[PDB]
Structure formats: structure tokens, C-alpha cells
């Protein structure tokens, strides 16, 4: 178990945080 | 802290 | 004490050179995976005939030029985790970049 179960929330969070970090990198530039 | 955060 | 401790996942189990040499000579280690940037660490996958079955142990060595003349002398296959599928995936990533 847990194989694509402990990954999908973490990858979801990483994608969301990455997109917001690109937007905030534009903001700080 | 920051005004726009709240 | 396998009948006393609770089961807690499967962590590696750091051995030493002497321990690994003993269980290689006695024919209990099935496969070795040399790793480390300095290549001084080994994942030893034991066989089912060993006293304990298949366990993925971790060994740290000094640089002794006699490892080959024990491992391939007795039974042990050396391997690396980077297969041709992983290499082709790396090539695909380079193409995307």
C-alpha cells in the first residue's frame, strides 16, 4: 500500500506551491 | 507583519 | 530478538566489512550494489537460504582490493541501479530541457 497514496497529496502540494512561488517570484522581481 | 497578508 | 521487538518497517541495518565478508564467504549474500560518491558503501541483498532470509543490509568498507576475489569468487553479482530504461528516461528529460 501507500505507493501512489503518500505521493499524490505531496505532489499536489508541490505543484500548487511551485505555481504560487513562480507568481511570487514575478512579484518580487 | 504584512498588510496584504491579512 | 525477532520474537521480542515489534515490527517497524524495513530499515537497512548497517553492517561492517568483517560481517559482510563472513556472510559472503558463507554464501549468504546474493547481490551487491556499490553506492556512495566515493563508492565505499554497499547494499547487500541476501538470499533466502541465509539465516534471516532476504534482508537489504548496508556496509561501509576501507579500500581493500580483495572484494572482487571474494564476491565473484563465491557467488555474488555486482549491480547498479541505473538500467537502460533509467538512462533513456534521462535522455528524454534532456530532450525536454
Amino acid at each position: 500500500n501507500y505507493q501512489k497514496m503518500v505521493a499524490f497529496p505531496i505532489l499536489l502540494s508541490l505543484s500548487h506551491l511551485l505555481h504560487r512561488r513562480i507568481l511570487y517570484l514575478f512579484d518580487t522581481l | 507583519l504584512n498588510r496584504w497578508s491579512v | 530478538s525477532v520474537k521480542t521487538a515489534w515490527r517497524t518497517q524495513e530499515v537497512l541495518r548497517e553492517l561492517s566489512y568483517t560481517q559482510l565478508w563472513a556472510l559472503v564467504g558463507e554464501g549468504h549474500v546474493a547481490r551487491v550494489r556499490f553506492y556512495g560518491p566515493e563508492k565505499n558503501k554497499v547494499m547487500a541483498t541476501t538470499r533466502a537460504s541465509a539465516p534471516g532470509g532476504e534482508r537489504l543490509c548496508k556496509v561501509v568498507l576501507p579500500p581493500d582490493p580483495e572484494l572482487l576475489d571474494h564476491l565473484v569468487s563465491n557467488g555474488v553479482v555486482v549491480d547498479t541501479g541505473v538500467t537502460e530504461d533509467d538512462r533513456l528516461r534521462a535522455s528524454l528529460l534532456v530532450q525536454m530541457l
Binding site: - | - | 556499490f34 568498507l61 572482487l68 553479482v77 555486482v78 537502460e84 538512462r87 535522455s91
Partner: protein
């Protein structure tokens, strides 16, 4: 020789290739006279800069007695040694193609009958052409090694084409 499908052929470790080359090397201490013949075909990639799946080192296709073919990926030069080096390196993951080529060089060394006791001392004259040259030799790898060529992979993409 046709470059095989690398992703489908069974793989063999550089350590196992080095051990087999040592076992077919009559100059080495680990020599095994009762060893199956090996056909070694060394491939160098020629689509490194034209294709996208290129590889840096060498790939040795080893054909056994029954026609079974495995391959070894000597992608990097390991412990850089001379061709006459016989000591195995510490930390076997330092076995690259330098050790493999050293073993290939050492295997093909000619073996001489025990006439050196009548040749290194001799009697007189040009002993090297009057008593040594009429002494012959046994190769020893030609009955246990092939090493039949060093090939190159096909490059289906031209280096200056629109596809490239």
C-alpha cells in the same frame, strides 16, 4: 555488426565481465582453462551528437557458448591503469573500460614452450633467429576468446540534416 536493442538484452556487470576476462587470461592468476568461449563485440556510439539517446563509453556484447548474448555498459573509464596491470582495483565499481582493455591486451599475449632455457642462454650466433624463431608459440585466447571486432553503431540521422 547490427547494434542490438540495449533495452531488451540481458545486462552483465563490468565486474562480471572483468572476472570472465581474467578467467580467459592465461597470464593471470585466476586463469581457468576449462572456460566457455566468449565472443566480445565492443560498440562505440556514433549518434552521440546526432541522436538523442547517445552514450559516452563502450558497450560490450558478450555471446556465450549457446548463442546467449548479454551486454556490459562500460560507460566511464574506471581506475585508469596501464595495459599490463593485473591487480584488481579496490571498490570494484571502479572497473571501467580501462581494466577491460588491459585484460583484453593481456589475454592475447603469446605463450612460449620451455625452450627459453635453451634460448635466454643459448649457445652462440643469432640465437633469436636460429633457435628461438624455430620454436613457435601457442596463442591461448584464440581457443577461448573471440574479441572479433570493435564495432560502431549505425547513425540513422545525418549530422547536418533537418532531422538533426
Amino acid at each position: 555488426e547490427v547494434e542490438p536493442d540495449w533495452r531488451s538484452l540481458p545486462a552483465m556487470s563490468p565486474a562480471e565481465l572483468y572476472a570472465g576476462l581474467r578467467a580467459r587470461n592465461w597470464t593471470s592468476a585466476h586463469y581457468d582453462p576449462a572456460a566457455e568461449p566468449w565472443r566480445l563485440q565492443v560498440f562505440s556510439c556514433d549518434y552521440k551528437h546526432t541522436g538523442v539517446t547517445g552514450w559516452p563509453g563502450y558497450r560490450v556484447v558478450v555471446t556465450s557458448r549457446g548463442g546467449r548474448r548479454r551486454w556490459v555498459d562500460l560507460a566511464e573509464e574506471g581506475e585508469l591503469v596501464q595495459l599490463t596491470e593485473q591487480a584488481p582495483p579496490a571498490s570494484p565499481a571502479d572497473i571501467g573500460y580501462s581494466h577491460v582493455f588491459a585484460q583484453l591486451y593481456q589475454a592475447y599475449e603469446p605463450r612460449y614452450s620451455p625452450e627459453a632455457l635453451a634460448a635466454l642462454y643459448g649457445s652462440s650466433s643469432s640465437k633469436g633467429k636460429a633457435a628461438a624463431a624455430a620454436a613457435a608459440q601457442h596463442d591461448t585466447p584464440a581457443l577461448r576468446h573471440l574479441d572479433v571486432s570493435y564495432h560502431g553503431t549505425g547513425s540513422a540521422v545525418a549530422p547536418g540534416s533537418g532531422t538533426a
